[PDB]
């Protein structure tokens, strides 16, 4: 179509924003499942303790 560099300018700018600005709430999210696995391994060790 037409170049209309305005579109690509806004696309890159708002992309970099909407990604870096909100990488962090995702980075929060990785931990919950991992620690759930921690719980489900420790409850596995408890029976050996028995």
């Amino acid at each position: 179509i037409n170049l209309t560099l305005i579109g690509q300018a806004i696309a890159f700018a708002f992309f970099v924003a909407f990604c870096m600005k909100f990488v962090w709430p995702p980075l929060i999210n990785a931990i919950s499942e991992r620690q759930r696995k921690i719980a489900d391994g420790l409850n596995a060790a408890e029976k050996a303790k028995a």
């Binding site: 029976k47 303790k49 028995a50």
Partner: protein
């Protein structure tokens, strides 16, 4: 169950120690009884020798 485990461990150790007390107290008491009985036997035997 992990919490239950240590309670059962202690409830076994204390019972084992009670068994320790009871049987070790019984043994030496029986030994003293045997000593007294042997002394009585010797008392009976010596006077028999003297009467003979």
């Amino acid at each position: 169950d992990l919490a239950d485990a240590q309670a059962q461990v202690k409830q076994e150790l204390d019972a084992a120690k009670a068994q320790a007390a009871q049987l070790i107290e019984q043994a030496n008491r029986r030994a003293a009884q045997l000593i007294e009985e042997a002394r009585t036997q010797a008392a009976a035997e010596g006077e028999r020798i003297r009467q003979q």
